[PDB]
Ligand binder design. Structure first.
Ligand SMILES: *[C@@H]1O[C@H](CO[C@@H]2O[C@@H](C)[C@@H](O)[C@@H](O)[C@@H]2O)[C@@H](O[C@@H]2O[C@H](CO)[C@@H](O[C@@H]3O[C@H](CO[C@H]4O[C@H](CO)[C@@H](O)[C@H](O)[C@@H]4O[C@@H]4O[C@H](CO)[C@@H](O[C@@H]5O[C@H](CO)[C@H](O)[C@H](O)[C@H]5O)[C@H](O)[C@H]4NC(C)=O)[C@@H](O)[C@H](O[C@H]4O[C@H](CO)[C@@H](O)[C@H](O)[C@@H]4O[C@@H]4O[C@H](CO)[C@@H](O)[C@H](O)[C@H]4NC(C)=O)[C@@H]3O)[C@H](O)[C@H]2NC(C)=O)[C@H](O)[C@H]1NC(C)=O
Lengths: 264, 99, 200
């Protein structure tokens, strides 16, 4: 069930030569879109740079994200208050079985969720005094609630369907990991067994350990992106030094037809 | 709230000496968004370093990738140095090849 | 040495841009180390100040843990373990139970008290749960300081209650200024309500 989600961020005091407002756009786990207040232009990212796309798509992403730039910076004026502020927004949609769109519209102030847009009602609201202040400022600004409604109920679902038709490739891309399994001495009597998966897509991957073909646990896992939208992971298990060769590492991944056993 | 950055250092492809590769420093789970990241070669900073867009996770905490094209060797040691308001002193994490 | 665990100021729990903190104080101390736990799970974001000397030649050590607003509201427990014979644990949290909306009533001074330099405006707040609350006053929308408020006291129906008294100059009242009792509670719409009062 693939999703188009904008991650928007405004700060009341940007560090020198960084933007007061910037947006990353995501089709599932890939970034397709970048926008910031300094350049003022929505742009395709990586593979989406040569998506079979219409001539005005990027101009219309730019138009919408500039209105959000102005809106997010108005919100600070409604707080007055004290300290510096971070307003974040998670706005988008996901397709539902019977050609229906399920929307998301949440906001966070200094790192904590406080506000949402109700798509049934066309109103901002939350449990918090700051949600009342920002909703009231926004709701009163001419056509703010309507463009928010439109962005989520019209633009996000059309954009999502166009990306499925025009960029199907980008989303079906399957790069299985390159694997390593190394053992390092840690404490006297003990070694750390690290199973590493390199340069894989999509991100869903399961690393677990066997000892003489019996489940020896998942180990302790880390996860991260690469520069090219591929991913990296490792899982470490502490083991009896002199026992390393009895252990192997198993990896499940959408790219691999059957699970892959990696030996030391 | 305020949140201290988690720091991972890994190569894009398995670490082969002599072979051209990419060194990644993934900084994640931090708030606020103002953060400084240096990639070090032999405890000295690399000038030709790029980064992904400052983004954030479902829990609203930010993340950021710093990466450089490099060619590793037996002798050369790499690290990531990070400074954030939540840190009293810079935090340095060495690239261990295992991971 | 002995410990005292202090909860966040209610007002800090109710405004998402304020910093609610649990303050764990160690008294009668040579070095102290703190551990903090949130519903069992340990966290590492606490901030310890330097020890300081008192009149009575003992050291006082203070460690503060900032807390997620919604975590404090969902009744999670904050445990501060002090290491120095054994370790001494203390735990704090918000009371469990069905949250209830404060009822607010304002009372003008009864002509009889009127013959004075100053008059007292009265605010009654009752039917609320839990006891975590903040009360303030405003004249024509701008804060006042010259007031006093009793501690939340449990009532016969299992809800809490409280009174606030704003002392003002007789003239300021008789010129027909709008005065407001402001109440901050988790169960209120956007955590805030206002009852206003002006000479009729
Ligand atoms: C040697 O010296 C020191 C220093 O005394 C200092 O020296 C000079 C300055 C003198 O002026 C002197 O008076 C000073 O004391 C002595 O240290 C003292 O030790 C005693 C214990 O012997 C401590 O007494 C306890 O006090 C608790 C309340 O303390 C607060 O209130 C007073 C003012 O009334 C202040 O002085 C304190 O600092 C505390 O103030 C609070 O501070 C919090 C933390 O900073 C604040 O919260 C934070 O605030 C910040 C910013 O402001 C943020 O907002 C944060 O979010 C927030 O967390 C808070 O605002 C502030 N409150 C107020 C009102 O000001 C008592 O509660 C406690 O009694 C309970 O427990 C006893 C047993 O353990 C029991 O016998 C009591 O009956 C009582 O029991 C409780 O009762 C209630 C009733 O409903 C129940 O609900 C409870 O469940 C129940 N609890 C228990 C456990 O049973 C103590 O009496 C004192 O704190 C400490 N002082 C200091 C400053 O640290 C030392 O003892 C001296 N030795 C001597 C003289 O022999």
């Amino acid at each position: 069930h693939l999703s188009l989600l904008y991650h928007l961020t405004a700060v009341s005091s940007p560090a020198p030569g960084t933007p007061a407002f910037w947006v990353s756009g995501w089709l599932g786990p890939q970034q397709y879109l970048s926008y910031n207040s300094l350049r003022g232009e929505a742009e395709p990212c990586g593979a989406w740079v040569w998506e079979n796309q219409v001539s005005w798509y990027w101009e219309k992403e730019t138009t919408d994200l500039r209105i959000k730039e102005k809106l997010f910076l108005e919100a600070f004026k409604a707080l007055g208050g004290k300290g510096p502020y971070t307003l974040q927004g998670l706005l988008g949609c996901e397709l539902g079985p019977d050609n229906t769109s399920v929307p998301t519209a949440k906001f966070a102030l200094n790192g904590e969720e406080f506000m949402n847009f109700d798509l049934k009602q066309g109103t901002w609201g939350g449990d918090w005094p700051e949600a009342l202040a920002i909703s009231q400022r926004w709701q009163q600004q001419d056509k703010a609630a309507n463009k928010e409604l439109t962005f989520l109920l019209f633009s996000c679902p059309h954009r999502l369907r166009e990306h499925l038709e025009r960029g199907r490739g980008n989303l079906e891309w399957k790069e299985p990991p390159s694997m390593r399994l190394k053992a390092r001495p840690s404490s006297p009597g003990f070694s750390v067994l690290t199973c590493s998966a390199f340069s894989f897509y999509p991100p869903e991957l399961q690393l677990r350990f066997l000892r003489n073909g019996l489940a020896a646990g998942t180990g302790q896992g880390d996860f991260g992106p690469n520069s090219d939208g591929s991913f990296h992971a490792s899982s470490s298990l502490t083991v009896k030094s002199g026992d390393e060769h009895h252990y192997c590492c198993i990896v499940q991944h959408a790219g691999l037809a059957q699970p892959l056993r990696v030996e030391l | 709230i305020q949140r201290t950055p988690k720091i991972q250092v890994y190569s894009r492809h398995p670490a082969e000496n002599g072979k051209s590769n990419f060194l990644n420093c993934y900084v994640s789970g931090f708030h606020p968004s103002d953060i400084e990241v240096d990639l070090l070669k032999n405890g000295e900073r690399i000038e030709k370093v790029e980064h992904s867009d400052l983004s954030f996770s479902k829990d609203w905490s930010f993340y950021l990738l710093y990466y450089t094209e490099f060619t590793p060797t037996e002798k050369d040691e790499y690290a990531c140095r990070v400074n954030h308001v939540t840190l009293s002193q810079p935090k340095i994490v060495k690239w261990d090849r295992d991971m | 040495p002995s410990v005292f665990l202090f909860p966040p100021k209610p007002k800090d729990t109710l405004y998402i841009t304020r910093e609610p903190e649990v303050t764990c104080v160690v008294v009668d101390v040579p070095e102290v180390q703190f551990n903090w736990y949130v519903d069992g799970v340990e966290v590492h974001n606490a901030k310890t100040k330097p020890r300081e000397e008192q009149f009575n030649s003992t050291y006082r050590v203070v460690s503060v843990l900032t807390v997620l607003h919604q975590d404090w509201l969902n009744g999670k427990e904050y445990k501060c373990k002090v290491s120095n014979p054994s370790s001494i644990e203390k735990t704090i949290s918000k009371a469990k139970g069905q949250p209830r909306e404060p009822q607010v009533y304002t009372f003008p001074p009864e002509q009889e008290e009127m013959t004075k330099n100053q008059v007292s405006l009265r605010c009654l707040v009752k039917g609320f749960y839990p006891s975590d609350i903040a009360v303030e006053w405003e004249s024509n929308g701008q804060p006042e300081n010259n007031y006093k408020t009793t501690k939340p006291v449990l009532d016969s129906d299992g809800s809490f209650r409280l009174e606030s008294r704003l002392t003002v100059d007789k003239s300021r009242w008789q010129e027909g200024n709008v005065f407001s009792c402001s109440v901050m509670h988790e169960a209120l719409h956007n955590h805030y309500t206002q009852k206003s009062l002006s000479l009729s």
